[PDB]
Paper text:
Alzheimer’s disease is the most common form of dementia and is neuropathologically defined by the presence of extracellular plaques containing Aβ in the brain parenchyma and intraneuronal neurofibrillary tangles containing phosphorylated tau. Peptides between 37 and 43 residues in length are generated, with those of 40 (Aβ40) and 42 (Aβ42) residues in length being the most abundant. These Aβ monomers tend to aggregate into insoluble fibrils, the structure of which has been extensively studied in vitro by cryogenic-electron microscopy (cryo-EM) and solid-state nuclear magnetic resonance spectroscopy, revealing a spectrum of different polymorphs. Two human fibril polymorphs have been determined: ‘type I filaments’, which are mostly associated with sporadic Alzheimer’s disease (SAD), and ‘type II filaments’, which are observed in familial Alzheimer’s disease (FAD) and other neurodegenerative disorders with amyloid brain pathology. Here, we determined the structures of nine ex vivo Aβ fibrils from six different mouse models by cryogenic-electron microscopy.
For tg-SwDI mice, which harbor the Dutch (E22Q) and Iowa (D23N) mutations within the Aβ sequence, we observed three different polymorphs. The other two polymorphs, labeled DI2 and DI3, consist of a single protofilament and account for 37% and 11%, respectively. For DI3, the atomic model consists of residues A2–G33. However, as described for DI2, this atomic model was built into a map with a medium resolution (4 Å) and therefore has limited accuracy. The model is the most likely one based on its fit to the map and the fact that it yielded the highest score in the side chain assignment method. The overall DI3 fold differs from the DI1 fold and aligns only in residues V24–G33 with the DI2 fold. Therefore, secondary structure assignments differ from DI1 and DI2, showing two β-sheets in the N-terminal domain. The fold of DI3 fibrils is mainly stabilized by a salt bridge between E11 and K28i+1 and a hydrogen bond between E11 and S26i+1. The C-terminal kink in the structure around K28 is stabilized by a hydrogen bond between N27 and the carbonyl group at G29. Additionally, a hydrophobic cluster around V18, A21 and V24 stabilizes the overall fold.
Numbering used by the authors:
A (entry chain D), B (entry chain E), C (entry chain C), D (entry chain B), E (entry chain A): 2 to 33
Write the structure that this text describes.
C-alpha cells in the first residue's frame, strides 16, 4: 500500500479544542 | 493498492472539539 | 506501507487550545 | 513503514494555548 | 520505521502560551 500526495495546502483556525492530539495538520505516525 | 491525490486544498474552522485525534487535516498513519 | 508527500504548505492560527499535543503541525511520531 | 516528506513549509501563530506539548511544529518523537 | 524530512522551513510567532513543552519547533525526543 502507498499514499502519494502532491503540493497540499492547508489553513487552520481551530478554536476551543480540548483533549485533542495533533490538532491542526498531521502527516506523521500517531498512536493512541 | 495506491492512493494518489494532487494539489489538495483545505480550510478548517473546527469549534468545541473534545477527545479528538488529528482534528483538522490528516495525511499520515494514525492507529487507535 | 509508505507515505510520500511533496512541497506541503501550512498556516496555523489556533486559539484557545487546552490539553493538546502537537497542536499546529505534526510530522513525527507521537505516542499517547 | 516509512514517511517521506520533502521541502515542507509552515507558519505558526498560535494564541492562548494551555497545557500543550510541542505546540507549533513537531517532527520528532513525543511520548505521553 | 523511518521518518525522512528534507530542507524544512518554519516561522513561529506564538503568543500567550502557558504550561507548554517545546513550544515552537521540536525535532527531538520528548517524554511526558
Amino acid at each position: 500500500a502507498e499514499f502519494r500526495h502532491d503540493s497540499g495546502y492547508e489553513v487552520h483556525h481551530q478554536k476551543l479544542v480540548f483533549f485533542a492530539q495533533n490538532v491542526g495538520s498531521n502527516k506523521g505516525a500517531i498512536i493512541g
